[PDB]
Amino acid sequence: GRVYLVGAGPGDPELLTLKAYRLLKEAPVVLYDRLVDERVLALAPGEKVYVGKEIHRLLLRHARAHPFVVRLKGGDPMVFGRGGEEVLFLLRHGVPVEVVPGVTSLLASGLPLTHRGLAHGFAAVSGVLEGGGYPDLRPFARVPTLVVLMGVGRRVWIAKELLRLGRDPREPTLFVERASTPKERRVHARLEEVAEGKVEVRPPALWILGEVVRVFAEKEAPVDALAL
Amino acid sequence: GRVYLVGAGPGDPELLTLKAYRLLKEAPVVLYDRLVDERVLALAPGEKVYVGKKQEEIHRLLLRHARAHPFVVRLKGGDPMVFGRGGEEVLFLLRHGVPVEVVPGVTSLLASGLPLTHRGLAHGFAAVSGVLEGGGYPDLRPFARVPTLVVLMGVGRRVWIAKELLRLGRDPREPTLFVERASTPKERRVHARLEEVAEGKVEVRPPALWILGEVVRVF
Numbered sequence: 001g002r003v004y005l006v007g008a009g010p011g012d013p014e015l016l017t018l019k020a021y022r023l024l025k026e027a028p029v030v031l032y033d034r035l036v037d038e039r040v041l042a043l044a045p046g047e048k049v050y051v052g053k054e055i056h057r058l059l060l061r062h063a064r065a066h067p068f069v070v071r072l073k074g075g076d077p078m079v080f081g082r083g084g085e086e087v088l089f090l091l092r093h094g095v096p097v098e099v100v101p102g103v104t105s106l107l108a109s110g111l112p113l114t115h116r117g118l119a120h121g122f123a124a125v126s127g128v129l130e131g132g133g134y135p136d137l138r139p140f141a142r143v144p145t146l147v148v149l150m151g152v153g154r155r156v157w158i159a160k161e162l163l164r165l166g167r168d169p170r171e172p173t174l175f176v177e178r179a180s181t182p183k184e185r186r187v188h189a190r191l192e193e194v195a196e197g198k199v200e201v202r203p204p205a206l207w208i209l210g211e212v213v214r215v216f217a218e219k220e221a222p223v224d225a226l227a228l
Numbered sequence: 229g230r231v232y233l234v235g236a237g238p239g240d241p242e243l244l245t246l247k248a249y250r251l252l253k254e255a256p257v258v259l260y261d262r263l264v265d266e267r268v269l270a271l272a273p274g275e276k277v278y279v280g281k282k283q284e285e286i287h288r289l290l291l292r293h294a295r296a297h298p299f300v301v302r303l304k305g306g307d308p309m310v311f312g313r314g315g316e317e318v319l320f321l322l323r324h325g326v327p328v329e330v331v332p333g334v335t336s337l338l339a340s341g342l343p344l345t346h347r348g349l350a351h352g353f354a355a356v357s358g359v360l361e362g363g364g365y366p367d368l369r370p371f372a373r374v375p376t377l378v379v380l381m382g383v384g385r386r387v388w389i390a391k392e393l394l395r396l397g398r399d400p401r402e403p404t405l406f407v408e409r410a411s412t413p414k415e416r417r418v419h420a421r422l423e424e425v426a427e428g429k430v431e432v433r434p435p436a437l438w439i440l441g442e443v444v445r446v447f
């Protein structure tokens with residue numbers, strides 16, 4: 001049958017799209033990935049099978065057993081999750097696929113990635129490639145606002161490299177662990193501090209570099225005007 | 229009262245978030261931006277006020293409505309925090325002591341359903357606008373060489389954008405794709421090389437999403 005590649009959002013169940021919610025309530029089977037919040041899953045009454053971490057072959061065998069199935073992925077399925085590969089593989093083996101976009105975690109910090117006088121665009125890059133290798137940061141090194149995903153374990157190397165490539169060592173950066181969940185933890189640090197191995201952060205985390213990080217901070221004191 | 233800055237999604241009302249939907253159905257007032265789908269607005273029973281288009285005026289107007297209700301919804305297309313001057317709006321409100329809550333949305337950047345990142349092709353992507361606050365032109369240099377580049381508000385100035393990307397060192401043979409009114413019944417997709425674009429050989433009308441890179445030929 002049919003396969004819906006659905007974005008679950010960053011975690012907060014209210015950030016699911018209406019289409020995703022309806023599909024989850026209605027789906028006979030939901031094949032979910034890693035980083036899918038238990039809150040989102042508890043909304044699904046059908047059979048819940050974990051697929052991820054050879055994933056292709058499993059998707060195929062459930063898609064055949066039903067009229068349609070939902071393949072659930074964190075955030076938006078088409079960025080940094082190999083969603084592209086799953087789509088190809090499923091089409092190549094005669095299975096229709098309909099992508100349902102979602103709120104990507106790149107947009108879960110609430111910060112304006114673009115802002116007048118600070119950044120007129122942004123870039124997003126992975127700290128880990130398919131196969132486990134290191135990313136080539138040159139093409140991204142100087143974009144006003146840089147967002148790094150899957151970059152916690154390698155934060156020191158990534159920072160040293162960005163510093164090599166020319167970013168301001170004093171640049172403010174923000175790490176946001178489990179954005180949109182009750183375990184959300186923001187860690188502020190300057191690039192240089194990250195390169196010196198001084199910042200404690202655990203995955204999964206959103207890593208944002210650039211002056212925008214600082215937009216909503218009070219003037220008279222280090223206070224998050226928007227958090228309060 | 230409080231101001232909820234809400235992402236309306238790219239157009240399809242089904243791509244609204246549950247939270248956005250809840251707020252829109254209950255808001256006594258909805259201050260909507262431009263390019264917010266007509267089907268999304270029809271869902272809001274409250275007072276609807278078009279608020280967009282200078283930015284100081286919008287602020288003054290946002291502040292006015294905010295003070296006259298327990299809460300109001302400021303509705304923006306896609307996600308409120310990218311390319312919509314959402315940061316300036318939030319900043320203004322905070323400075324005037326108006327509580328603000330940001331509700332993310334499905335950005336038009338992801339409305340084509342295409343993989344912006346893909347094995348061996350692109351390990352990240354960039355997004356830039358062809359029009360800055362004030363109407364000026366973008367310094368494309370920092371974005372010229374990213375594997376997958378997505379350009380918003382780049383339809384009218386496409387020819388110029390293409391040329392700059394070429395002067396900045398990008399490949400003329402690079403495949404690109406234009407997706408007009410993504411997620412709507414009139415969606416339309418136009419293929420074309422960076423070459424044909426710089427040559428004025430491509431016709432696309434706004435609003436459109438402009439994706440550049442090999443991932444364009446993945447599907």
Ligand SMILES: Nc1ncnc2c1ncn2[C@@H]1O[C@H](CSCC[C@H](N)C(=O)O)[C@@H](O)[C@H]1O
Pocket residue numbers: 010011035074075076077078079080081103104105106108148149150151176177178179180203204205206207
């Ligand atoms: N709730 C969350 N908080 C912080 N980072 C998150 C997150 N959900 C996903 N991520 C980031 O995403 C990486 C997994 S790659 C999958 C990304 C997903 N397609 C999306 O659009 O968000 C993690 O290592 C982390 O960097």
Ligand SMILES: Nc1ncnc2c1ncn2[C@@H]1O[C@H](CSCC[C@H](N)C(=O)O)[C@@H](O)[C@H]1O
Pocket residue numbers: 238239263304305306307308309310311312334335336337339379380381382407408409410411412434435436437438
């Ligand atoms: N349905 C749609 N199809 C194609 N492009 C769209 C679109 N809706 C918005 N856009 C793009 O967005 C530009 C407006 S700038 C506002 C972007 C919005 N914040 C978002 O996250 O999507 C347009 O010029 C166009 O390039």
